[PDB]
C-alpha cells in the first residue's frame, strides 16, 4: 500500500490562501494564471530541450557519418582528429542535454497535480425530465395513535402520498366506527383529522400535504407536546360525520 502519488496536488481556488486586504477573486485569477504560466513554461522548456538534445545527437550522427566518409579517404585523418574533438565535446554537451532531460523528468516528478493533469473527461450526458393502498398497515398506523410510530410507519411508503391512502382512511374510519368498538375509530381518526389539519395547513403553505407530513409531525422537537393542542376535540367533532357515514354504512353492511 502506497499513497505517495497523491501527496502533491495544487489547486488555485483555495479558501485558505485568502488575506483580508487582497480581493479573493483577483487572487484566484492570479494564482490560476501563475499555474497556467508555469506549466506551459515547463512544457516549453521540455519541448525546446526535446529539440536541442535531438539535434545534438543528430550532430553526433553527422560527425560520425562524414568522419566515416573521410575514414575511407586517403590522408585526411587530421580532419578526423579536429572534428573528433569537436564531436567529443559535442557528445558531452549532448549528455548534458540528457542530464537536464533527466532533470525534466525530476520536474515532472515535482510537477504538482492540478485539476487538468489529474483528470481528463471521458464521457458526459444530460437529460431533462419532460414529464408533465396497504389498508392493513393503515389499520396498524391507526392502532398506534402516537403519530411518531404512524409517521415513520407511513413514511415506509410512497403510497401514503397518494390520495388513495387518504381516501382509504375515510373508508376505514367509516367501517370501523360500526365494528362495535368506538375507541379504535377515534384512535385512528386522530390521524384522519390530523390528515385534514395538515391538509389545510400545508394549504396555508399551499404545499402538497405529502410534503408537509414530516414538516408537521416533527415540526419542533417538542412537537407541540406531541400536538396535545386541539386534536381530541376536533376529532370527536369529525367523529360526528364519521358516525353518520358509519351508521348509514352498517345499514348496508
Amino acid at each position: 500500500v502506497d499513497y505517495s502519488v497523491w501527496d502533491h496536488i495544487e489547486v488555485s481556488d483555495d479558501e485558505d490562501e485568502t488575506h483580508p486586504n487582497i480581493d479573493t477573486a483577483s487572487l484566484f485569477r492570479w494564482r490560476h494564471q501563475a499555474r497556467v504560466e508555469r506549466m506551459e513554461q515547463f512544457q516549453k522548456e521540455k519541448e525546446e530541450l526535446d529539440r536541442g538534445c535531438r539535434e545534438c545527437k543528430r550532430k553526433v550522427a553527422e560527425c560520425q557519418r562524414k568522419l566515416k566518409e573521410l575514414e575511407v579517404a586517403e590522408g585526411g585523418k587530421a580532419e578526423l582528429e579536429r572534428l573528433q574533438a569537436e564531436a567529443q565535446q559535442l557528445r558531452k554537451e549532448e549528455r548534458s542535454w540528457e542530464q537536464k532531460l533527466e532533470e525534466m523528468r525530476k520536474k515532472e516528478k515535482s510537477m504538482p497535480w492540478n485539476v487538468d493533469t489529474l483528470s481528463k473527461d471521458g464521457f458526459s450526458k444530460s437529460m431533462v425530465n419532460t414529464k408533465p393502498k396497504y389498508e392493513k398497515q393503515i389499520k396498524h398506523f391507526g392502532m398506534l395513535r402516537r403519530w411518531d410510530d404512524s409517521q415513520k410507519y407511513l413514511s415506509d411508503n410512497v403510497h401514503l402520498v397518494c390520495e388513495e391512502t387518504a381516501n382509504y382512511l375515510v373508508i376505514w374510519c367509516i367501517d370501523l366506527e360500526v365494528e362495535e368498538k368506538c375507541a379504535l375509530m377515534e384512535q385512528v381518526a386522530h390521524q384522519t383529522i390530523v390528515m385534514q389539519f395538515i391538509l389545510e395547513l400545508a394549504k396555508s403553505l399551499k404545499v402538497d400535504p405529502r410534503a408537509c407530513f414530516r414538516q408537521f409531525f416533527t415540526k419542533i422537537k417538542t412537537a407541540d407536546r406531541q400536538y396535545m393542542e386541539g386534536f381530541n376535540d376536533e376529532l370527536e367533532a369529525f367523529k360526528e360525520r364519521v358516525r353518520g357515514r358509519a351508521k348509514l354504512r352498517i345499514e348496508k353492511a
Partner: protein, 633 residues
C-alpha cells in the same frame, strides 16, 4: 565494528487490542466489513465460474443472508462465496495484515473485470467490537467443512466441523456482548445496511423470526434489503429517464421524480463517475443551518465512505442531490475519510463545472427553466455573491422583470438586445415589491424617454448586484443615485441649465431651512410628474440597502448605530408646486408657511423614496394639523 541486523516483530496481544479499540470510531461498522468481505468472496467465485462453470456446480445462487437469533444472542452472516481452504483459514483469517483478496487479484490476469473491496487485511477482526467469541464455519471446494473459533485471545482453533453441510460458502457466527445487544433487533440492522453497503452487487436477505401462532404470520420472512441496483455504473444511452427517476426516489425518499439529471464520468488518476439530480421542488429546510450541508454521498467501490463534507460542493449548490463513486482513493485505515483532502478539491471543481453546464443546458426548456428558476433562484444569486470564477457564467442564468417585459421574466441578454443604441448601461431599481417600484418616482423620466429598466425586488438582490458590476461590457447603474446621466439632446441640456439658473436660489434657502438632514439640493433630471425625491450619495449606502442591513438579526449593533446615510434632495422644476414655491419665496423670505410646507413635502418625499422617517409622530401630527383645518374643527 559489528552491525547486527534484526527484523521487525510484533506483540500480537497488544496489537490486536489496538486494532479492536482504537481504529474504528463508530461501533456499527462491523456489519459493513463482514458484508464487504462476503461480497469479495462472491466475486471470486463468480469470476471462477466464468472460466469454468464446474466451480458453480456446488451451488447456483450467490446471495448474502443475515440471520439474527435473539434467543442465543448470535447474529450469523451466511454467504455462498468461495470458501476458505484449511490452509487459507489459518493463513488469511489467522495472520493480521494479510488479505487473500489482494492475492487473488494480483494473481489474476491483468485487466480482469472483477474489482474487489478490501485490501488492508485487518477489517475482519472488527467483529470483536461487538462480540467476544467469533465462530467461522467455512466449507470450500477441495476441502471439508472446517470451523475456526476464536475469542480474541492469542489463540485460534481450527477444527473440522461435522454439522450440516453448508455447501460452498462461509457462515460467520457472532456472539454478542451483553452490551451491544442492540444489533439484534431488525430495526437497527435494516437501518445500517441502508446506510452503508446498500449497493453491493448481491441480494442481501434478512431472516427475522416473528411468531403469531394465533393465520400465523411471518414465521420467517426474507426482506431483501438491498433492492435498487446501482445505476451510475451502467452506461448512459441505456438509461431511460424513467429508470433514472426510480433511483432518485430511492436515493431520497420522494413522492415525485427528479427534475433534471446529469450523469458523467472522468477517467484518469482520479477516476470517478457521478450522478447529479436537481429536485423538482425546493426542500423546506434549505438554508436552515440544518446539520446536513451537502446531500451528495461519496462512494468507493460502492461502499458508502463519507457524506456531508462541505468541501465536496460549495454552499450555493447545496440542493443538488447526488452520488459520487470512484474506484480508488487514498483512504484512512478506518475507511471513513480520505487521507489527504485536496482530492476532494479536484472533485469539487469538476462537479461545479458539470453542474453549471447542466443548468445552462436547462435554459432551453423555457417552461422547465421557469419552474426550476422560480424554485431555486435564491441559490443562483447566492452563488453570484460567493463564487468568484463562475460569477460570469452564473449571470446568464438570471431572469428578471423589467419595465418592458410584462408578467414574464427575461434574462439579462434579452435586455442587452433591446438596448437603444446609446444605453451604455443597464438600468435597474431595487425595491420591495413590483408595483411599488413600477410606479416609483425615479423611473418616470425613463419610461417617458423609452429607456428600459429592471425591477430587482428581492432582499437577496443587493448582495448580488453589489458585486455584479458589469455584464457583456455594458455596466449597471441604479436609478436611485446622485447622477443618473441618460442620453439627451444639447437643447435639453441648455434648458436644464436654464432651469438651474432659475431655481438656484430656491435650492439655497431650502437647504437653509431644512438643515441637518440633506447634504444638498439640486434641480432634478429624472422627475416629470412628482415635485421632489431623494437619491443617496454615489458612494454611500442606498436607502433600500440600508433598510436590509438594519433588519438583519445578527447585525453588529455598534456599526449600525455609527452608520448614517447622506441624503440629497432633487426638485422637479416644471412642477406647479415648486413653481408657486419659488414665487412665494422670492416674494418674501422666512415666511412661516414656506417653512412648514417645505418640511412637509420633504417628509413626504423621504417617505415615498423608501427611506423611513426617524419618528413618524411629528409627521402624523403635521398631518393632523392639516386635517383639523379642513374639517374646520
Amino acid at each position: 565494528e559489528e552491525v547486527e541486523t534484526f527484523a521487525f516483530q510484533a506483540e500480537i496481544a497488544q496489537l490486536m487490542s489496538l486494532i479492536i479499540n482504537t481504529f474504528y470510531s463508530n461501533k456499527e461498522i462491523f456489519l459493513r466489513e463482514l458484508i464487504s468481505n462476503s461480497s469479495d468472496a462472491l466475486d471470486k467465485i463468480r469470476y471462477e465460474s466464468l472460466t469454468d462453470p464446474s466451480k458453480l456446480d456446488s451451488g447456483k445462487e450467490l446471495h448474502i443472508n443475515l440471520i439474527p437469533n435473539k434467543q442465543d444472542r448470535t447474529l450469523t452472516i451466511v454467504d455462498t462465496g468461495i470458501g476458505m481452504t484449511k490452509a487459507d483459514l489459518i493463513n488469511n483469517l489467522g495472520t493480521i495484515a494479510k488479505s487473500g483478496t489482494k492475492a487473488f487479484m494480483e494473481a489474476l490476469q491483468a485487466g480482469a473485470d472483477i474489482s474487489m473491496i478490501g485490501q488492508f487485511g485487518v477489517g475482519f477482526y472488527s467483529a470483536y467490537l461487538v462480540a467476544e467469541k467469533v465462530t467461522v464455519i467455512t466449507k470450500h471446494n477441495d476441502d471439508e467443512q472446517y470451523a475456526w473459533e476464536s475469542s480474541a485471545g492469542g489463540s485460534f482453533t481450527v477444527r473440522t466441523d461435522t454439522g450440516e453441510p453448508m455447501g460452498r460458502g462461509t457462515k460467520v457466527i457472532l456472539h454478542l456482548k451483553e452490551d451491544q445487544t442492540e444489533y439484534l433487533e431488525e430495526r437497527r440492522i435494516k437501518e445500517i445496511v441502508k446506510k452503508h453497503s446498500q449497493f453491493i452487487g448481491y441480494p442481501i436477505t434478512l431472516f427475522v423470526e416473528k411468531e403469531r401462532d394465533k393465520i400465523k404470520e411471518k414465521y420467517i420472512d426474507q426482506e431483501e434489503l438491498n433492492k435498487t441496483k446501482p445505476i451510475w455504473t451502467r452506461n448512459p444511452d441505456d438509461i431511460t429517464n424513467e429508470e433514472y427517476g426510480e433511483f432518485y426516489k430511492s436515493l431520497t425518499n420522494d413522492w415525485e421524480d427528479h427534475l433534471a439529471v446529469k450523469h458523467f464520468s472522468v477517467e484518469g488518476q482520479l477516476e470517478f463517475r457521478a450522478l447529479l439530480f436537481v429536485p423538482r421542488r425546493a426542500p423546506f429546510d434549505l438554508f436552515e443551518n440544518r446539520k446536513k450541508k451537502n446531500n451528495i454521498k461519496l462512494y468507493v467501490r460502492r461502499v458508502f465512505i463519507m457524506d456531508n463534507c462541505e468541501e465536496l460542493i460549495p454552499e450555493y449548490l447545496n440542493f443538488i442531490r447526488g452520488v459520487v463513486d470512484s474506484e480508488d482513493l487514498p483512504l484512512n485505515i478506518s475507511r471513513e475519510m480520505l487521507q489527504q483532502s485536496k482530492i476532494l478539491k479536484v472533485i469539487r471543481k469538476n462537479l461545479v463545472k458539470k453542474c453549471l453546464e447542466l443548468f445552462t443546458e436547462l435554459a432551453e426548456d423555457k417552461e422547465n427553466y421557469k419552474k426550476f428558476y422560480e424554485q431555486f433562484s435564491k441559490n443562483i444569486k447566492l452563488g453570484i455573491h460567493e463564487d468568484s470564477q463562475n460569477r460570469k457564467k452564473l449571470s446568464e442564468l438570471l431572469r428578471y422583470y423589467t419595465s418592458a417585459s410584462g408578467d414574464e421574466m427575461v434574462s439579462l441578454k434579452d435586455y442587452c438586445t433591446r438596448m437603444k443604441e446609446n444605453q451604455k448601461h443597464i438600468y435597474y431599481i431595487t425595491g420591495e415589491t413590483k408595483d411599488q417600484v413600477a410606479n416609483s418616482a425615479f423611473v418616470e423620466r425613463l419610461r417617458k424617454h423609452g429607456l428600459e429598466v429592471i425591477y430587482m425586488i428581492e432582499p437577496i438582490d443587493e448582495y448580488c448586484v453589489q458585486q455584479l458590476k458589469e455584464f457583456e461590457g455594458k455596466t449597471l447603474v441604479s436609478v436611485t443615485k446622485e447622477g443618473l446621466e441618460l442620453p439627451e439632446d444639447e437643447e435639453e441640456k441648455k434648458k436644464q441649465e436654464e432651469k438651474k439658473t432659475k431655481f438656484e436660489n430656491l435650492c439655497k434657502i431650502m437647504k437653509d431651512i431644512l438643515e441637518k438632514k440633506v447634504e444638498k439640493v439640486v434641480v432634478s433630471n429624472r422627475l416629470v410628474t412628482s415635485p421632489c425625491c431623494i437619491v443617496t450619495s454615489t458612494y454611500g449606502w442606498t436607502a433600500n440597502m440600508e433598510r436590509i442591513m438594519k433588519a438583519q438579526a445578527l447585525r453588529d449593533n455598534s456599526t449600525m448605530g455609527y452608520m448614517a446615510a447622506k441624503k440629497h434632495l432633487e426638485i422637479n422644476p416644471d412642477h406647479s408646486i415648486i413653481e408657486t414655491l419659488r414665487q412665494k419665496a422670492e416674494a418674501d423670505k422666512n415666511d412661516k408657511s414656506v417653512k412648514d410646507l417645505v418640511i412637509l413635502l420633504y417628509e413626504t418625499a423621504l417617505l415615498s423614496s423608501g427611506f423611513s422617517l426617524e419618528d413618524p409622530q411629528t409627521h402624523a401630527n403635521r398631518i393632523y394639523r392639516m386635517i383639523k383645518l379642513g374639517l374646520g374643527i
